[PDB]
Amino acid sequence: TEFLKPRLVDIEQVSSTHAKVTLEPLERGFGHTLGNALRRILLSSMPGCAVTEVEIDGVLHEYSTKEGVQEDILEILLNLKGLAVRVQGKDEVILTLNKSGIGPVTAADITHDGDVEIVKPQHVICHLTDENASISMRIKVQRGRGYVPASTRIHSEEDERPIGRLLVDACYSPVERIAYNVEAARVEQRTDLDKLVIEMETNGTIDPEEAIRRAATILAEQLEAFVDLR
Amino acid sequence: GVLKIVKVYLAVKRRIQPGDKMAGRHGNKGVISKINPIEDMPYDENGTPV
């Protein structure tokens, strides 16, 4: 075995959302081996934070309509699914949003909690039409992984049923898109030696660099079981 | 005979799922057999899954 390890070379960060990562040198065939294995974990297994429960005062269910608000509660909730959140310390944080008057309610109207970071403060949530109208809600953000729909969550625990809580989808998975390209790394001697270019596209939260590190960690954790137990 | 009547209205959100019937506009029907994870689905050179 003349073992030949790759090392992380170039991190083009085109945007906070989109980031390209070249990787070399790779031995022949390891391009696709690592490329797909990482793609699968990055789509299905990636950990993140997302809105789980929302409680608006003066709102019993998600199908009602609040006066002075253009959007029905369902449409407001769908906007909160797209709310990009980082929790630093705790696993579960409840943010408060109180706003009034005429204007597009943005994510910045949420009371900035110390550890919590809102990635997109200009994110639209609600449009207030009448000046007398005020909206007040308590948005719970939990940390998990993958996709946890409200329907899969309405058939598990449900120890308490407080008439007033609304369950909405929360895509924990930060990763929106991922593709890997195997290009030739015309290596000093070897022409079969190749590079792996991983084009990642996330929403907020996870850093591209950090996410790749985590995904490789999960794969290596799973291999400990096979290298160890025979 | 009837003294009073109470009408309850229930609301239900139904998710798409295996067994559900889907069609196009050219009379092309089908039943959904399986929901595939994003990772598994055929993807473009650009990486976008079908």
Q: What separation in angstroms does the CA of A113 have from each of A24, A100, A104, A198? A: 41, 20, 21, 34
| Structural tokens at position A60 | 């019993």
Q: Is B21 on the interface with A (CB under 8 A)?
A: no
What is the Cα–Cα distance from A187 to A26, expressed in whole angstroms?
Answer: 10
| Structural tokens at position A43 | 């789509």
For B46, which of A43, A151, A179 is closest by C-beta distance? Answer: A179
Report DSSP state, residue A118.
E
Q: Provide the pairing of β-strand A134-145 with A92-100.
A: antiparallel
Cβ pairs bridging A and B (under 8 Å): 25
Residue indicated by tokens 């959140």: A85
Domain extents for chain A? Answer: 1-47+173-230, 48-172
Helix (H/G/I), strand (E/B), else coil: A157: coil
CA distance A43 to chain B (A): 6
What is the Cα–Cα distance from A85 to A49, expressed in whole angstroms?
Answer: 6
- Which residues contact residue A79 at a Cβ distance below 8 angstroms, ignoring those fewer than 6 apart? A71, A123, A124, A125, A126
Closest Cα partner for A20 from B39, B42, B46? B46
Q: Least CA distance to A63: which residue of chain B?
A: B11
What is the Cα–Cα distance from A71 to A158, expressed in whole angstroms?
Answer: 28
Q: Which CATH architecture has domain A48-172?
A: Beta Complex (2.170)
Q: In Å, what resolution does this model reach?
A: 3.9
What is the Cα–Cα distance from A128 to A69, expressed in whole angstroms?
Answer: 5
Domain A1-47+173-230 identical in fold to domain A48-172:
no
CATH topology of domain A1-47+173-230: Gyrase A; domain 2 (3.30.1360)
